[PDB]
Amino acid sequence: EQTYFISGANRGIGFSVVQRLAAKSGVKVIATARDPASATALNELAKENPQVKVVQLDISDEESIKKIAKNVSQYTDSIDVFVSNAAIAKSFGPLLNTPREQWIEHFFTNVLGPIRLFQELYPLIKKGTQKKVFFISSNAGSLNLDFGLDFSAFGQSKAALNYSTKELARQLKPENFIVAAVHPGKVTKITPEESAAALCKLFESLNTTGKYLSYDGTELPW
Amino acid sequence: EQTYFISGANRGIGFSVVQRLAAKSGVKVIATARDPASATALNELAKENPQVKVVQLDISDEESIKKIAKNVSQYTDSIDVFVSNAAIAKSFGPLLNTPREQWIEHFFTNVLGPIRLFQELYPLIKKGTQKKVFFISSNAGSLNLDFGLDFSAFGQSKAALNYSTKELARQLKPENFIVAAVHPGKVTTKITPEESAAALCKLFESLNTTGKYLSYDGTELPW
Ligand SMILES: NC(=O)C1=CN([C@@H]2O[C@H](COP(=O)(O)OP(=O)(O)OC[C@H]3O[C@@H](n4cnc5c(N)ncnc54)[C@H](OP(=O)(O)O)[C@@H]3O)[C@@H](O)[C@H]2O)C=CC1
Ligand SMILES: NC(=O)C1=CN([C@@H]2O[C@H](COP(=O)(O)OP(=O)(O)OC[C@H]3O[C@@H](n4cnc5c(N)ncnc54)[C@H](OP(=O)(O)O)[C@@H]3O)[C@@H](O)[C@H]2O)C=CC1
């Protein structure tokens, strides 16, 4: 029935999302890892559960992104639900203390990567039924939330991706796409499995485009 | 006396702000161009108003930015009013149709450029009296306005820099800095460069509180 694509599936929320989706009948899961050979838990899941297909992706690497569509296509003729989950969070604290390379790495990995990944997998998503597009954002990316914390290149990258996500939702509303930015929670802290359970109910239930959502389905201000 | 710094002063609003500042007594202007020797208007401006100093800045070029503090330090001990004006606006419309290079170029020129520029000229701004920091933003950069247009890399770059401008306002409030993101208007409702400059100069002088996102007319925009 349905194909999910989850970037960054070897650990954290991505692994827990793939584990949760692997439990549902009639769900095929394209799961990505930078280094699949070292994705122990994900490889063992895929060994027990043939519905889970493991593909290499480095979203920091144009040469990897240029291959994701042809490689995914070996395993599926369509994607129902796209989840750009793979990301970095390596730069917090004041602007004056954040060197050039942190800004660059968060832009390439957290902004350009997800945009190029979507661009490449759009034809596969257009061919699917559900046409859902989820960007795993952060409440730190809001322009209208104050946490009393600096988020530096990490927060900027989530705001940047948020801006483009909102635009994308407008652009693909006439093609009946559902596009969302989703804050997965602080992983008060929640566990990745709890986040994944809530994220997967959201992925299945969300029926409107253009939303910025917390994992529980409540709205966040852009 | 006060020292103003303006990136991208060879044409557009940049030129019009420098021209207006040059008219105000006791103002010295550090004015930037990528190619100061081709900046015929600004060079003539500076010839007639030598309080205007023309320095080389390409905000897309880290090697250029690594030299700005030294180039500016030639002419001043301090900056009272910093203005990141220099920027590009090359990519609009759909994401699927926005190639890699357009995303990269707006990030490097419109986001990284200004943060690097501010990091480099912060010691000079710190020594100054007014501690005013202005990023020429766009209303298109708002996460909370709908123009019935898509702004692609351009709009993303203005929203990215807005996020950091807000953080920078918070971060520098202790040091009594005034940090603002300012939409200068859609200059040639379009308004003239000279109209846009007059509004901005008034804003640059009047603004007394940090963390604001302002249109040229002094009303606030939602982040
Ligand atoms: N959990 C939280 O508290 C919050 C997290 N988020 C969002 O949650 C999402 C998931 O976070 P979480 O699982 O905790 O993060 P982790 O850092 O634990 O995991 C990140 C995942 O992304 C992968 N990844 C990183 N860089 C790349 C790359 N260049 N190419 C491909 N894959 C890559 C990692 O693979 P590898 O093992 O190779 O490094 C890993 O699978 C992120 O997208 C983030 O934006 C937002 C804010 C709050
Ligand atoms: N354009 C607009 O009216 C709108 C955009 N804005 C802001 O307006 C401001 C610019 O106004 P204005 O000058 O009239 O518009 P322009 O269309 O003239 O903007 C280009 C300016 O930036 C300079 N510049 C461009 N690229 C670089 C670079 N890599 N390094 C250094 N300088 C560079 C140009 O110099 P060069 O001649 O060498 O190319 C020129 O001074 C920017 O802050 C922009 O973000 C805000 C709202 C609407």
TrEMBL record, chain A:
Q: What is this protein called?
A: Short-chain dehydrogenase/reductase
For this UniProt record, the keywords arranged alphabetically read as follows: Nucleotide-binding, Oxidoreductase
Q: Which PANTHER family does the UniProt entry name for this protein?
A: SHORT CHAIN DEHYDROGENASE, SHORT-CHAIN DEHYDROGENASE/REDUCTASE SDR
Keyword Oxidoreductase appears in the UniProt entry: yes
Task: List positions binding NADPH.
Answer: 8, 10-11, 13-14, 34, 58-60, 85, 87, 136-137, 158, 187
The entry lists its GO molecular-function terms as: alcohol dehydrogenase (NAD+) activity; nucleotide binding
EC number annotated for this UniProt entry: 1.1.1.1
Query: Per the record's keyword annotation, is Oxidoreductase included, yes or no?
Result: yes
Pfam families, alphabetized: adh_short_C2
InterPro entries in the record, alphabetically? Answer: NAD(P)-bd_dom_sf, SDR_enzymes, SDR_fam
User: Which residues are NADP(+)-binding?
Assistant: N10, R11, I13, R34, D58, I59, S60, N85, A87, K158, V187
